[PDB]
Paper text:
To elucidate how SemD functions at the molecular level, we determined the 3D structure of the protein, N-terminally truncated up to and including the APH motif (SemDΔAPH67-382) at a resolution of 2.1 Å. The resulting structure revealed that the C-terminal portion of SemDΔAPH (aa 138-382) folds into a rigid core, consisting of nine α-helices, which is N-terminally flanked by a long intrinsically disordered region (IDR, aa 67-137). The proline-rich domains (PRD1 and PRD2) are within the IDR and provide a highly flexible interaction surface. Furthermore, electrostatic analysis of the rigid core of SemD revealed a large, negatively charged patch on the front of the protein and a smaller positively charged patch on the back. We found that SemDΔAPH is a monomer in solution and the p(r) function indicated a globular core – corresponding to the helical core domain revealed by the X-ray structure – and an elongated tail. Our SemD structure implies that WH2_1 on α-helix 1 is largely available for interaction with G-actin, while WH2_2 on α-helix 2 is not fully accessible, suggesting that WH2_1 might constitute the G-actin binding domain.
The early secreted Cpn effector protein SemD binds to the inner leaflet of the PM below the invading EB and directly recruits G-actin and the essential endocytic proteins SNX9 and N-WASP12. During a Cpn infection, the C-terminus of the membrane-bound SemD interacts with the BR-GBD domain of N-WASP, thus triggering N-WASP activation and Arp2/3-mediated actin polymerisation via an unknown mechanism. We demonstrate that SemD, a protein of 382 aa, can interact simultaneously with the PM, SNX9 and N-WASP, thereby combining membrane association and deformation with modulation of the actin polymerisation machinery.
Author numbering: 11 to 72, 79 to 247
The structure:
Amino acid sequence: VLKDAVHSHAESQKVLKKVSQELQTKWTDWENNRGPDYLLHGYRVIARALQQTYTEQSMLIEPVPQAVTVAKDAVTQTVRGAIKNLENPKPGNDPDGVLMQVVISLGIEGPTLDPGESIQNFLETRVSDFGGDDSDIDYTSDIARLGSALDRVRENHPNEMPRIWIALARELGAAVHSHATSVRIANAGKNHTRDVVRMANESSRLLQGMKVLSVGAWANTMTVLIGDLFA
């Protein structure tokens, strides 16, 4: 390589760990001290990232196999399950957000995953990440249906994946907005929209920089933020 780029890669590795640590210290201070505003800034960042995959994947769109229609049906079914688990649980269960946390991770991170990792492996990894291995609900059939439908499309015709990301991102973005207003109204008298907007802009510029530097590092930091949302 150029000597020059090899030196810049090391400098980038150092900047990357500094930004990750600064993000997590900012978020721990904000969650600790700024209460509900922290959660609302979280939803704002998540909504922005979903809008990002919505627009970028919309740019990529240039007969369409049945596997695509099956994948679209699997994402609506699974997102429905995620929201039901979170906001209208069965009699005898408590609200559970991990399925929502994993499908949001998929909407945000899925388009930039390495081809070598299957969607099914991604989903299982993030169920583990969000503490879902010790839970009350079985996510097995939900994540199975999503993972198999999406991996069928990703193996047979990856160039068709945008149609799925688009539909996933759009629906999730709407669900986030609806849910954010519920949290916001629940905290009437304590909301500071100026601080939410500022916090969301700081977080987003640091996360976007991190994403250009290392998509896996960005995805792990995003996992931390998403873990604080959806109860």
